[PDB]
Write a protein that binds this ligand. Structure first.
Ligand SMILES: CC[C@H](Nc1ncnc2nc[nH]c12)c1nc2cccc(F)c2c(=O)n1-c1ccccc1
Length: 815
């Protein structure tokens, strides 16, 4: 009934729906009701999409950011295949008319009625783009492999669709009364309060009296702030630090206006969070661990039922050098000049805006509502917490709406982290994310896992749980596809626990055949088979190949799980790596950032042949990593074993002999080149990102020659030199001792890659800035972000920045 759906939702999101109701919170109840209706409405929009439109929804196109190729095409019901010779400039439709024509001239006698599906993948070829513009067609073109497509009729596509159906007056100073407190430590106690607007103070901080530490203390003391009530901005938050003195203890935050714009009065009790002192960016909701949390009771005086004013009320109420408070000055009362001729300097203007005086806010807000929509880049900036105003927030979302799904996919990790800055449940960002997720099934997929992966974190468990419930309201079908994934994940965790225990008392071979017998149980085989990969929903994991599964007998004992699809061929031969105990958040950001570099590089005609493999936290220190097959570790290669084709007279030849043995004849030149581009790319990626501890065990190489890094762990120096491994350098130089020709080719690739990224330095700064919200220990300060600015060197000219890169590069061929 409606009871099955709720029950599955509770199971899927890892928090029982009954818990939301137990809260008796009308903000929560109104979110669940408003957002439910919102998502149910998208669902009904979706179930009457035209078949091409539904293809777009469910299998969005994977495009790259003259020549002839061999193609193989069949139909759904058939087993019979045709192999054609088409161009690369040919549209998909051209391909489809060929297929249909030979179907006639084989079965005896309209392209528009079909789409092309990659065999064994939820991925399709359609639209007026030449074949080479397709990522699948491209991967094939570089691996020598032949594309395998299936002609799928609009009437079967329609089947899939249906299958998935379902006030200014108050001029007295702001003051609170600090009543009591409720938990203990070790000395005297102090409560520091601060009115904050984002990260800036609306006035001086105000402390309290000192009382003896034990208790359950009592102040009943009146804290009054240097700020009038009528000047409290909408998004103003009051922040408390509780600590000790002759020693940090707890913090807690509260909005002065509720989620209904009403100014807060009366007494409220604050269940604090443990520290290490004021913490303005911390969540504005209480600690859910009410049992053992210090509690802070305060009283907000009832200054009359005063609402924050409607906007209609609010609206009625040398300089280019800069592109000091003798500089703000001229930005602010030349504000109109900034709207006229510098509409992109909005951020700067909002920053010199004093937010502690209401009639200033109104004049900014008056300019804001007439402000021309801004570029995505600028928009990404405005989402930062340093622009806490809810109207700036809406402007930002509004300027963000022109995000393509690819861009949105690319930035989604950040946007999701920014949810932790939000002051209320119901907000524009969330509505924006659910709207986009419901419009694109891949976005939906990853929005879900980013939220799901943090349900063990109580700061966000409620917000994130609510958001997943709403989404689940929007696609009952995808919810079940997603449960399917989580039943797989649940199994791998129990499997991994077994292997960990087993391997502490048993040889590896015997634990492996033990792992296998466990996988062979009915329960496992069913749960682990026939799902979409959480790493990429267009990858289908069909039959788990048990004999090819194993584990690494290192540390966390990660699992190696292989799959096959008797209908995808070699494209269905795919693996996933499950790891439990390590924190995979660091690696996901790094590999996301490397993916972006790769895109930026490729849009300026530079392909450094990167391997940005999937990496996905799915839970508390739990996740999946994408298996890159036909690759081996440098360390393994460098072992220089006997009886191997790669066996070498000098250790430095090992890497190259291995390459020769995998790439005989004139195949060899291609692999050196791939090695060269990919090494260039990774050297630069790790330098900019400040990723040290790079060694032969966390660098791998593909039989094609491509090199790629793994297990990044940290980034941002937590100052890393550029590095150059002589062993890589001597693959690049083709085995030859000196080879400036081939060494400077590579120097060029490094420089070109470096300068290209430099040109997009603002994008990386904006993205990393928003990631501060994620709570990665490597990404906290301003000196973390300063690290990126120096590795990209944006405080300098392209000419002299290149000169600084050359010295570090040259210092790096030290070895
Ligand atoms: C750490 C190196 C390596 N990591 C990776 N191997 C393949 N694709 C990857 N994608 C990300 N990390 C990728 C690895 N990771 C594993 C993880 C779990 C279970 C395992 F058996 C392995 C394993 O055997 N290797 C391995 C080692 C030496 C050669 C070949 C593969």
């Amino acid at each position: 009934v409606k009871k099955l759906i709720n029950s599955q939702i509770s199971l899927l999101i890892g928090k029982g729906l009954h818990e939301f109701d137990s809260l008796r919170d009308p903000e929560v109840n109104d979110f669940r009701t408003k957002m439910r209706q919102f998502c149910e409405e998208a669902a009904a929009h979706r179930q009457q999409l035209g078949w091409v439109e539904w293809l777009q929804y469910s299998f969005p196109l994977q495009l790259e950011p003259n020549r002839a190729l061999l193609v193989n095409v069949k139909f759904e019901g058939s087993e019979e295949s045709f192999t054609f010779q088409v161009s690369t400039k040919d549209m998909p439709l051209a391909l489809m008319a060929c297929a249909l024509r030979k179907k006639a001239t084989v079965f005896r006698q309209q392209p528009e009625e079909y789409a092309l599906q990659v065999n064994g993948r939820h991925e399709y070829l359609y639209g007026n783009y030449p074949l080479c513009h397709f990522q699948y067609i491209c991967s094939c073109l570089h691996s020598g492999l032949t594309p395998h497509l299936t002609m799928v009729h609009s009437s079967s596509i329609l089947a899939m669709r249906d299958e998935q159906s379902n006030l200014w007056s108050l001029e007295q100073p702001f003051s609170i009364e600090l009543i009591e407190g409720r938990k203990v430590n070790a000395m005297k106690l102090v409560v520091q309060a601060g009115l904050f607007h984002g990260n800036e103070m609306l006035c001086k901080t105000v402390s309290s009296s000192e009382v003896n530490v034990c208790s359950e203390p009592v102040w009943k003391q009146r804290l009054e702030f240097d700020i009038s009530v009528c000047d409290l901005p909408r998004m103003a938050r009051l922040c408390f630090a509780l600590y000790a003195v002759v020693c940090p203890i707890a913090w807690a935050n509260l909005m002065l206006f509720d989620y209904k714009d009403q100014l807060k009065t009366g007494e409220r009790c604050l269940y604090m969070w443990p520290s290490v002192l004021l913490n303005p960016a911390g969540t504005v909701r209480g600690n859910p661990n009410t049992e053992s949390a210090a509690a802070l009771v305060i009283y907000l005086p009832e200054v009359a039922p005063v609402y924050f004013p409607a906007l209609e009320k609010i609206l009625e109420l040398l300089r280019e050098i800069l592109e000091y408070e003798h500089e703000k000055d001229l930005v602010w009362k030349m504000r109109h000049e900034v709207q006229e001729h510098f509409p992109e300097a909005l951020a700067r203007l909002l920053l010199v805006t004093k937010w502690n005086k209401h009639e200033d806010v109104a004049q900014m807000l008056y300019l804001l509502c007439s402000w021309p929509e801004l570029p995505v880049l600028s928009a990404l900036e405005l989402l930062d917490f340093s622009f806490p105003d809810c109207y700036v927030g809406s402007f930002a979302i509004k300027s963000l709406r022109k995000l393509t799904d690819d861009e949105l996919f690319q930035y989604l990790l950040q946007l999701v982290q920014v949810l932790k800055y939000e002051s209320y449940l119901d907000c524009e960002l969330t509505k924006f994310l659910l709207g986009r997720a419901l419009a694109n099934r891949k976005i939906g997929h990853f929005l879900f896992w980013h939220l799901r992966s943090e349900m063990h974190v109580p700061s966000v468990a409620l917000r994130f749980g609510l958001i997943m419930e709403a989404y689940c309201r929007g696609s009952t079908h995808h919810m079940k596809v997603l449960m399917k994934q989580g039943e797989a994940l649940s199994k791998l965790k129990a499997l991994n626990d077994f292997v960990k225990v087993s391997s502490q008392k048993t040889t590896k071979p015997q634990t492996k055949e033990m792992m296998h017998m466990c996988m062979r149980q009915e329960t496992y085989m069913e749960a682990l088979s026939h799902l979409q990969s959480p790493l990429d929903p267009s990858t289908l994991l069909e039959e788990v190949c048990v004999e090819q599964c194993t584990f690494m007998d290192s540390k966390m004992k990660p699992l190696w799980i292989m799959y096959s699809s008797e209908e995808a061929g070699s494209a269905g031969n795919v693996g996933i790596i499950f790891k439990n105990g390590d924190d995979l958040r660091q690696d996901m950001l790094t590999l996301q950032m490397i993916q972006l570099m790769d895109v930026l590089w490729k849009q300026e005609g530079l392909d450094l042949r990167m391997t940005p493999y999937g990496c996905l936290p799915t839970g508390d220190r739990t996740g999946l990593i994408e298996v890159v097959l036909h690759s081996d570790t440098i360390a393994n290669i460098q072992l220089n074993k006997s009886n191997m084709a790669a066996t070498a007279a000098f250790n430095k030849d090992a890497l190259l002999n291995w390459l020769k043995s995998k790439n005989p004849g004139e195949a060899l030149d291609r692999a050196i080149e791939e090695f060269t581009l990919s090494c260039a790319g990774y050297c630069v990626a790790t330098y900019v990102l400040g990723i040290g501890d790079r060694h032969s065990d966390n660098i791998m190489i593909r039989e094609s020659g491509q090199l790629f890094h793994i297990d990044f762990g940290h980034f941002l120096g937590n100052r890393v030199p550029f590095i150059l491994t002589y062993d890589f350098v001597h693959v690049i130089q083709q085995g030859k001792t000196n080879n400036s020709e081939k060494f400077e080719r590579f120097r060029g690739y490094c420089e070109r890659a470096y300068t290209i990224l430099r040109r997009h330095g603002l994008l990386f700064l904006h993205l990393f800035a928003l990631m501060r919200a994620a709570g990665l220990p490597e990404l906290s300060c301003s000196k973390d972000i300063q690290y990126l600015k120096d590795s990209l060197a944006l405080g300098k000219t392209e000419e002299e920045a290149l000169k600084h890169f050359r010295v570090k590069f040259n210092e790096a061929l030290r070895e």
